[PDB]
Amino acid sequence: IAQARKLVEQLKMEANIDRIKVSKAAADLMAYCEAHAKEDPLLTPVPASENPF
Amino acid sequence: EQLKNQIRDARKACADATLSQITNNIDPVGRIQMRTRRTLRGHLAKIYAMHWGTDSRLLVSASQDGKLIIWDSYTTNKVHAIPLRSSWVMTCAYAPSGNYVACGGLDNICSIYNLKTREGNVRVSRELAGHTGYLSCCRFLDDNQIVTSSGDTTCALWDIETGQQTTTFTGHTGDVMSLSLAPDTRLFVSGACDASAKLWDVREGMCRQTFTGHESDINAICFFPNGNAFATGSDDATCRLFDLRADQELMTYSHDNIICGITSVSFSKSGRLLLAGYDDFNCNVWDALKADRAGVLAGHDNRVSCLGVTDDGMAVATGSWDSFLKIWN
Amino acid sequence: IGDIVVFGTVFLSIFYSVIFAIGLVGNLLVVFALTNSKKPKSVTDIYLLNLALSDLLFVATLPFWTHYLINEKGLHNAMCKFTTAFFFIGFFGSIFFLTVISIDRYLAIVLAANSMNNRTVQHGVTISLGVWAAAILVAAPQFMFTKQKENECLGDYPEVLQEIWPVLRNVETNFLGFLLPLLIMSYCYFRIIQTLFSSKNHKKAKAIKLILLVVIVFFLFWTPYNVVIFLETLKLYDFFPSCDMRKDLRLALSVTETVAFSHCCLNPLIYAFAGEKFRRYLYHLYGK
């Protein structure tokens, strides 16, 4: 099958990409969240003086 | 299935610690209050999509009445009224420069309109034709390049000047429902009606990675503010967060009480707070890290179809089928 | 023929008080039900809201009658003009809006394609303003020549007008009550019934039956007032041979007012047992 042969090459690219530990990715995500936590009006409520809504 | 086991083994090998265990040290956000600061009124049909503006004041919404109007969120009034040739619109996009607006739908063509660039009037700029399926989603890559997803399992990138497809992504299996743009404006991820959501490369035009785990069709998807992760909203009452590096669902957001599917998924400015627009007439607010409910948004009468978060996080706009748009915070 | 007033003033005042309470509660519930959700309201919904507003006008003008009955203080000519104006504009608005509901149902059922094609059908707000303006204009002559004489405010017409003004007013109000609206409603509902039976929608036409029942209740409870108005018109036209009518007319007017206020209070009670969604809304409201 032409489609089956083409799909074989597609899976090779996905399998050959570099993959890191899930713990490191989660730690990076948490670090980014804490980095911008003070700049999030949803997470940190903003006074109505600076709130334009 | 030799390749199927290789990717599965790599995910298992890279699996070291779940996000829930790591988030034990951090303090839960807890319950927070959602209040409608203002309500946008004037639509007479179900609202299916909306997009926030880069100016954080102007937003555009799409409704089944054939009108694609732009709302001024600061002063609570409409600034433009764009009639649509086809009343069946299911997606809309707002250009980052603010001079362009897009809308798709069941007409299989993506229309581009000039947002009062000259002469103080709105007119059709380009009609992107070449899709054999309904435009499920569309997003402006640049002021001249736009990437859209259609109902024919294929995603295409369009150029306004040429009017043709610069590249086409046909690696999907199920019907694509939505796509999101990474902040770096170099990658985009799209979810399909199958169980696999796969990342795409703008320059390469090939499927770099594929993510699985959902038990039903994926309806919404949105990149995380960092740009190395994204969340998927499916009909299996489960929101799964996927990391572009871990290549696995490091965090799942499924609650027994809410068994309904997810229609819209959006992230806050920091990404700690994740908002998902469910179709149980509400829009549950989750926490990306703690993977638990952080707020309740029950200000809509009909099912929530679209949900948008402002770029600076100033306010959150939620749309639903009741032809009403409400701005939160 | 002979009639004697045997109605206790304290019992009648208590009756008006309980009528006020029931009517206020019913009108508030109806208005809340018709403005409960953010979804667009149908034209019939705004017509029912206008009818509830007319009933609210009735329950707001009856306190003046109670003040005459028991308080007997502050009974000025201006206040009599105020209360008579409210009562008559409420009655005229009620009858006119019921006629408009009948016409709207006739268009929606019989000339459904024509009604949908017409754009003025959906524009119910301008129709409501026009109906209110017409009711105010037609009730304007009903109270603009009244004053108080001997603890009973009536008459006080100019000598030139008094020859024909009272009889003309009575015949005009009797006509605009039960001559044109009666025939119009009868024809409209007859056509609606014919269409429903021909198209076999009678098993699901609960709203039409409810509106017809409300119209019938209104007509039966307002019939004595128009009958005594016609008797007064005949008496002024010396066509009535009996002499005891000149004595029993006051009691007839009093009892017609009482039955009219009873109709006003029980008007939105019909929507409770007969209206499935209204009853469902009451359960939701009682939960809060």
Add this chain to the structure above:
Amino acid sequence: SAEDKAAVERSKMIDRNLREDGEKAAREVKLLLLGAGESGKCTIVKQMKITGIVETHFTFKDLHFKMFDVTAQRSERKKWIHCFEGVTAIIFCVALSDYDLVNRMHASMKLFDSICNNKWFTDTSIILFLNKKDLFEEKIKKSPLTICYPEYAGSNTYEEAAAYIQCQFEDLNKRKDTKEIYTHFTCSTDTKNVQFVFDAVTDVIIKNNLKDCGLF
């Protein structure tokens, strides 16, 4: 505050334009076209006056109708059929001579069952059209129809076969109080078909007007 006043008045004028446009759209009649492999029976009329969705406009008895064919939409039906909620009626086309062809009748009945029992079109009625009647006249003679239905137990004539097909299609409703299915047989002339469409639309409008009140 001149700029604010100008913005406010522009917003009010475009809001009133949107309101009048929505009222005009509501004055129109929206119809949805469906079918497993049969289409064009209603679009071939001469009354029509005006890509995945094709919009056809035709005026009959001073009433404007809008048809939306979905044949070009080959994607998943459930992902976009919700956009058609609120249509006055749905036109479903079935070929009477599809029983022998391949299973086609079974597929059409399955599609009809899926559309009717989709918990999104419960209030809206369905107009059923049975086309290819002229060819079915000889098809029922040539094909005994017993192979299609093992438990048919009926006469091998056109009338009995058509009645059985109509009954089988009606049995897939399971919601008779909420919606009513109108069944018609396609004729040589389009006048009968357009008259049936107008009658069904008028009946649907009457039914909606019966429940328009939000207080009864």
